[model samples]
Target: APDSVDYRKKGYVTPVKNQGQCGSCWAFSSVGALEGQLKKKTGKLLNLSPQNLVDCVSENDGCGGGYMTNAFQYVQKNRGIDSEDAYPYVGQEESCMYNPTGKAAKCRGYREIPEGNEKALKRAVARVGPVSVAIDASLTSFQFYSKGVYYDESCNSDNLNHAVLAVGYGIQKGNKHWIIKNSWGENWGNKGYILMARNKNNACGIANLASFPKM
Candidate 1:
């Protein structure tokens, strides 16, 4: 693998998704990874439903919050997930209407990246498809990030409250960064992407709980 690589440029990245005002970042992150792998496996792109996970997946809080691992488990146990066109995003807590037979994609299982290891994360992104990751996304800088490499020392691992996708990695200037795909819409950073500081002892808990489903 090269020192710098981007999955988006390689035609593996899907369109930027929006989580809206819901605390469903976990759903979007999980769907991003799943969508990427599904495309890689089948050579066709389908927008998997985060709304399905937000509503149907057990052990999750809907708009209140959720876990990426829980979302993956729901897909695996249910055998697959439906397309966004069929189960469109509502951006709010709602009752589940998932139909197991109508699912659009399937995932075998998911594996977590080695905790606190940036090298392992890079390897995973290079070998696997995109990866779902947790991070401290409550910082003010993150809330309004537009462009450039983001390195926030105040963003710590203590509070990993949000989830995003790690689509690629590269070196910017003298710093190695992870290309993060956010779910806050294209109005945010770099059309809904951020380059986060990598290899800094798991800054923002980005590497603490990274994982992706195998299609």
Candidate 2:
């Protein structure tokens, strides 16, 4: 495995997107992982719709909060989800607009990294392309994170509150970090990317709740 990996650097990731004040970050997180793997296998990078999950997945509380596993299951059972151009995002959840005719991508299944296994999570991102993981995004440091490796003791696995995509991981300035892409658009973090502490007992719950898709 390489010392560092970047889907954005390799052109497998879509542009950083925003979720507004809504708690639709979980959808974007899952969709981000799906888009990267789908593009890698199919050779077509698609802007998949988060609105499909927000509105269609009954288990998820639209504009409230959700988990990665449920979204994956929704995509699994639905057999497909529509592209952003067709379904589009309104920031707020609306009635399900899923149509068999508009689906842009599908996944046979998804795999979860063993909870708390940071090594396995790292390997998945390296071999599997992209992965979705929940984290404690409530800290003041996280709320205002810009650039540089982020580490905070309060960001543990017990209180994971938000979801995001772990695109890559590597060392920076003698600090090991996981490069994650947030759904808060480009205005936040490092051009919509956040480098959370890695190999320090899963700082930010990154390795505690993680999974990815198979195209």
Candidate 3:
């Protein structure tokens, strides 16, 4: 039988959150993956602070742009991250207000799956924890997406500009999709999530840079 894993149903996925006009979606994606691993390893699905990484990760330009890979390493080196309750998001760049004592989540390191392989990403999402994935979210429809499996040919496969989390994978009727946990709050795409068309030659580069935190 084909693998169908939903971290949401299993309580490993955290609630949806917004990223505003900030470019810190990368931070949210990283925290989502780390939160999944933390919960899977310690039985506590805490909402770690993306703002912590946004403000303190000097290597990544706060709110300008960044990568999940970098944030994962920062978390590892720093040894932990604060919870949203301690260091909330302000949706803009700000001074580093990280408090080491308030740390609420952590991970050992991270792992990147083979690039451009549909099965590899699927396997990672199903077997590993939640995955951080980069995709080409350059389409207008993708911005206001509401429901159903999303697919568009004009989406540049090699242009992965947006980072999001891959929380699960499954088929609907006959179509396959990757259940992505977005950082656009509960108003966007299916309660802050989207099921991007999967196995369609890695449409929109869903598997281009799939990664997950090691816990």
Candidate 4:
């Protein structure tokens, strides 16, 4: 049980990105976790290619949507991933441009937080740099989220439809929140970030399928 932690304050959280109309939130989440891990371990921030995973990872559904674990496995098996400069994000499905010789970041493996456990997720974020998570982003509460702790009663755990990065957690005015990094651009929430209600029975299923890579 960690009280507070912020990867952005630690210089591991990368700049906010835009996934556009594509359902590629999973790619952004995977990229964010990998970027944070690379920064934490190597002391250097590298923008890895989310498009590489979007295009090359056959297991995932590309821009139509995907899973963070599948993206991690693709990177692990492929040896590494390229920098964003090498394979920039197109926000749409395209053929793979992954270059085996131009990989910029690599991960040894990944670990998942125990399902339906907010305490485990908090500990993982405190011990690890950032954790990738999936959530029910289809709710209107999430679409127009501007600020404050987001809690949508209509959002259900069974149909988690979007992915994001859980960078940290903290108590704000007696209420706890999971600081989530989103891929819908800076205009979406608090500069592409959202504070989701934490310790509330895994609101939006943030703890379900939560994971992070091992650099």
* Candidate 3 per-residue lDDT over residues 1-215, each given as its tens digit: 24688899988888999999999989999999988888888898889999998998898988898888889888889988999999999999899898888898877888998989889888888788689999999899899898889999888878989999998999888889999999988998898989999888889999998888887
Deviation in angstroms for 45 in model 2? 0.5
lDDT of 4 at 45: 87
TM-score of 2: 0.97
Once fitted onto the true fold, the runs of candidate 3 whose alpha carbons sit more than 4 angstroms away are none
lDDT of 2 by residue, 133-190 (tens): 9999999999899888998877767888999999999999899989899999899989
* lDDT (10s digit) by residue, model 4, range 34-98: 99999988899888888999999899999888988889988999999989888988889998889
Model 4 sits at a Cα RMSD from the real structure of: 1.0
- Which runs of model 1 end up more than 4 angstroms from their true locations? none
The whole-model lDDT of each prediction reads 0.89, 0.90, 0.89, 0.90
Candidate 2: misplaced stretches above 4 Å?
A: none
lDDT of 3: 0.89
TM-score of each: 0.96, 0.97, 0.97, 0.97
Q: Report the C-alpha displacement of residue 144, candidate 3, in angstroms.
A: 2.4
Clashes of 4: 0
- In order of listing, the candidates' clash counts read 0, 0, 0, 0
What TM-score, to 2 decimals, does candidate 1 have? 0.96
